[PDB]
Design a binder for these strands. Structure first.
Lengths: 43, 48, 37, 185
RNA sequence: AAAAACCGUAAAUCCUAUCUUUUAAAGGAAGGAGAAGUCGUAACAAGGUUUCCGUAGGUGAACCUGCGGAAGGAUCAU
RNA sequence: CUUUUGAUGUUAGGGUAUUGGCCUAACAUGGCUAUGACGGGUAACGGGGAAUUAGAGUUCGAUUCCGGAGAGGGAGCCUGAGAAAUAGCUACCACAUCUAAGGAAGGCAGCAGGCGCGUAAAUUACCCAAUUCUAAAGAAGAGAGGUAGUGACAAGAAAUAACAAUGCAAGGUUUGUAUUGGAAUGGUGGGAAUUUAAAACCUUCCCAGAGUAACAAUUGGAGGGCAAGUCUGGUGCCAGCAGCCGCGGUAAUUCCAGCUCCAAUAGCGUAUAUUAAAAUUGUUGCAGUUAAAACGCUCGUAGUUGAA
């Protein structure tokens, strides 16, 4: 066996945060956004 | 629940070509041997 | 399995010789059991 | 030991979670009627399906049958009280002819914005949540409420809502303004 | 009343045999999986001796022969 | 199979509250059985019920209640109408306590909690205020029980915005799409009425109380089943992922990552059990020449169907 390579890709992969971005909408806001995005504007 | 004992690599089917980090465990409920594959690439060292 | 054996499309051994060898094993196993018990 | 209170589910799982056509029709209806999530439309499906099952089990009975002429008259009377089926609709096939928009027309959030009051469907929804309405003599705040045909006649604002003559407006804004005016005077 | 016997209920201990369930055991004999290991041409074509079956014997192994069958045959046929 | 040790029955008797092989004596040789007895297993208390249903069915049923059994496991027994009672007694073993060592007393499978087991399960709280019980029956008890506590076992309701301008696109002056900015309410802190045996929670009201409403919602994926990326970085048969097929040897659409997006939503994954899918247990509803499958052939009793 050569079990001394576990997690090699995990260790060698670089590191990035998830930036700032916007507070993702919840409740009815996301559904309304999706509906208006997918029916009214498109044609 | 069981007790980890030793670490031995296990091979795979012929079309595949890789190694699997499988660990043998001695159960306390019955007192038998089992072999279990550890998930996660770095979790092999994450266990005592 | 059952009596619908052989059907050699699988390209296996000859079932007749398979049975012959199995019967020889049966015979020597019976000899061993008679000697032991 | 156990408490003697019954309890049961309301919404059934649709199964087959990824049909494109059914999912997109659900999208069209959710956009049309401005509800909050798929579970609500699922429970409405449950109610409509139960009504249809009752209609089928009553239609399978014969003519001049006591069970039909009792249970069916009860069910049609309840549907009429709900306002789902009009005066010209009187038969069991017409009872079966229910549809999702027909059932959703009765909800509070649809009714209030259909009759006026609010500017958006979701505006009406949030207003119902903020409890500025009254069904007449009683204030409600649950959008899943179902009104009746005679219950619609006297729907209006709440009595204690600031729009309706209560405490006028922003206490913080008004109080800062009066402090500023008093200090400047 | 202690105390005693009697048919009786019968606790509990041991012996005996049986049954049920897991487990040891020198060696023996199978199966499976693995990996480019070793020996052969057995089978799929008329597979280079048509194939297969039932049975008896023999060979290092795939196998072979003898007897009676089948075509799932290589023939639907002077 | 049962029948010396009552098996089946007759006669007579003892016994019990009544009857009876319940038991006693005599006499008889009988009773059950492929319509599966006697046996063995059941990680088996039975039922109305629960899960799933097109309808048939299959599976779980300790579990609110009815009935049965038990209080370590057998045995026995008094009192009492009624107990073979166990928070009544006696005796054995296995445990185990106190012990001045001579001797005593024990049963949490009652309400709490401890050990052990295992993945697995809540406070040594309050009170008989509600129900209903006991008695010498209003004023006393009731871990029956109600309340409080822990509680993402499950189930139901519903926040995490909406709205007016401007600019953008799309269109004939309508929708969504970042700027401005004020109205509106929950969340929360507090104070109160009511509430309750007390206290709490809800309910209603009054002060404070939202702009990045810092008062923020995530789990799992994005090759096919399967809805959603040959988008961009790192690795290069390794690490790995993958329910199945499968991808990875320099463009990795499948691995480790960032963006975007997706299904679900205060919920979703993991595993085992289980049902439907299963018309792959098929009575309505399977198949049998060649895929799995009509016994070598016939007679034949039980069973099964049978002219008019």
């Amino acid at each position: 066996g050569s079990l001394a390579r576990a997690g090699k890709v995990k260790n060698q992969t670089p590191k990035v945060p998830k930036l700032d971005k916007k507070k993702r909408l919840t409740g009815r806001a996301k559904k309304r956004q999706l509906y208006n995005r997918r029916f009214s504007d498109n044609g | 629940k069981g007790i980890v004992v030793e670490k031995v690599a296990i091979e795979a089917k012929q079309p595949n070509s890789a190694y699997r980090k499988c660990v043998r465990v001695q159960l306390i409920k019955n007192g038998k041997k089992i072999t279990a594959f550890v998930p996660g690439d770095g979790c092999l060292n994450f266990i005592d | 399995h059952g009596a619908s054996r052989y059907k050699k499309s699988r390209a296996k051994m000859r079932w007749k010789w398979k049975k012959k060898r199995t019967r020889r094993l049966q015979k020597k196993r019976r000899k061993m059991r008679q000697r032991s018990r | 030991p156990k408490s003697y209170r019954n309890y049961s589910k309301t919404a059934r799982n649709p199964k087959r979670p990824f049909e494109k056509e059914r999912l997109d029709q659900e999208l069209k209806l959710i956009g049309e009627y401005g509800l909050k999530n798929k579970r609500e439309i699922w429970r409405v499906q449950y109610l409509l399906a139960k009504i249809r099952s009752a209609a089928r089990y009553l239609l399978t009975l014969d003519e001049k049958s006591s069970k039909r002429i009792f249970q069916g008259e009860a069910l049609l009377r309840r549907m009429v009280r709900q306002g789902l089926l009009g005066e010209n609709e009187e038969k069991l096939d017409y009872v079966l002819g229910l549809t999702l928009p027909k059932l959703l027309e009765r909800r509070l959030q649809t009714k209030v914005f259909k009759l006026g009051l609010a500017k958006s469907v979701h505006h009406a929804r949030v207003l119902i949540r903020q409890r500025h309405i009254r069904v007449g003599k009683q204030m409600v705040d649950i959008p899943s409420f179902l009104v009746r045909v005679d219950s619609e006649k006297h729907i209006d604002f709440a009595t204690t809502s600031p729009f309706g003559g209560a405490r006028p407006g922003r206490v913080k804004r008004k109080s800062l303004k009066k402090q500023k005016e008093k200090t400047e005077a």
